[PDB]
Design a protein around this ligand. Sequence first.
Ligand SMILES: Nc1nc2c(ncn2[C@@H]2O[C@H](COP(=O)(O)OP(=O)(O)OP(=O)(O)O)[C@@H](O)[C@H]2O)c(=O)[nH]1
Ligand SMILES: [Zn+2]
Lengths: 50, 113, 311
Amino acid sequence: NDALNNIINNARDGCVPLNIIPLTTAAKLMVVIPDYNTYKNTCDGTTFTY
Amino acid sequence: NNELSPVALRQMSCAAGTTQTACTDDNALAYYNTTKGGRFVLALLSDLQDLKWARFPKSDGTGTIYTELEPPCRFVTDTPKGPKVKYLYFIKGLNNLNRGMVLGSLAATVRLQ
Amino acid sequence: SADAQSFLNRVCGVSAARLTPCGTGTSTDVVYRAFDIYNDKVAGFAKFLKTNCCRFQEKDEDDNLIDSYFVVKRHTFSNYQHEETIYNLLKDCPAVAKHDFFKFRIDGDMVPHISRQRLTKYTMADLVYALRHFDEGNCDTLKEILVTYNCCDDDYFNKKDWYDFVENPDILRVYANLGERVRQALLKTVQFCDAMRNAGIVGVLTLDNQDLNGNWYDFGDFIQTTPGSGVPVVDSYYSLLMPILTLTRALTAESHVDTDLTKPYIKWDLLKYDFTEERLKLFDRYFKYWDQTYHPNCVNCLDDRCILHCA
Ligand SMILES: Nc1nc2c(ncn2[C@@H]2O[C@H](COP(=O)(O)OP(=O)(O)OP(=O)(O)O)[C@@H](O)[C@H]2O)c(=O)[nH]1
Ligand SMILES: [Zn+2]
């Protein structure tokens, strides 16, 4: 209830799209990888950016 | 060719004003069209210089609509009379094809300037 | 003797005019093309057979043919004066092809010709007809159009099911290469409508009077009115062209910074959801003379027909 409040107050009338709430306030991320070629382009190493 | 209304149309008669009930007897060469479902006028011509309103009578007589007009345009005509000036109007909301129809017929059947 | 080699250098203008005849002498050329007709006894959108035209392709420095034609048409003397007057009124628009009126004798009499310069081989109805009446048994026009504009190469069609949408979904990427041409054609159409309104000319716009570069011609069915009171009729044009606007994705350039396909994308904030003004700006930019009220939000519509129209 702090990140959600922080992004709610920035809205000009209190309404925000639902598709950007997990994108900016979630704490955990889950990735499903088909094969190794896709793996080495998305989550290579120990830290990645998304 | 895609052309603009070969078979033409017929007629122009009746009235006009500027503030609702200002239409007294007849102040408009209200032009054209008697459609197949009933008389539906297209173009308005005015020997006067400023009108915002008209009242065309039809069928029942009790049903005669107080039409809202639009800002006018002006031109001079090549009539045998000589110097003759009107101020053109169309009934508001008239789509482009209808104005093209009446303008083409007026320009190609009768002479203007 | 003379004639062919004198008509050639008379059609040859004053700019560079490296011309070559399209298998003719002084006679006309016959082709099979698509038109949009309405003349009180016939109507429709079909493929008729053109009859009165002589075409000269243009060369360049290394003597290899290019996509430029000088398509002269032969018609009536009254039509000569009418078209000359309308063109003289409309010649300053940058969206109007360059006309050239001259007179030349084929016999003891003198007949008039009208020559148009630097057109393409196909028009925009040819493209619309090819895409809206698809038949894999014979689609030569579509293949020619695709290969002459660097959308693909001639060996792309050696594949089978190259046209299918479920198999080979790469045909979408192949088709999406004409969107910029379509967008430039739309902009030139808006320019032409503005010029017609300012000059006081009344006429109806069809797809077969515009080539694939956007230029306009054929003012044979227009009339004249007082300046500032012109009115173009653009119903059939937009209505028939509409299904092609999404197949080729013509509005892709509108997601870039300056409507330029070489700059990065626009970065909207994630909290914006209205976009009610961008829709109006797009409508005013690409559909200015479409005369029917447009509601960005379908909650203000009057009935189901208006809902369909605005959706
Ligand atoms: N762009 C282009 N069109 C061509 C060519 N050859 C034939 N055409 C066809 O020929 C037409 C050339 O224009 P016009 O014949 O002036 O058009 P139109 O609408 O038939 O003319 P009017 O009968 O005078 O109203 C186009 O509609 C094309 O369909 C060509 O080399 N280039
Ligand atoms: Zn609506």
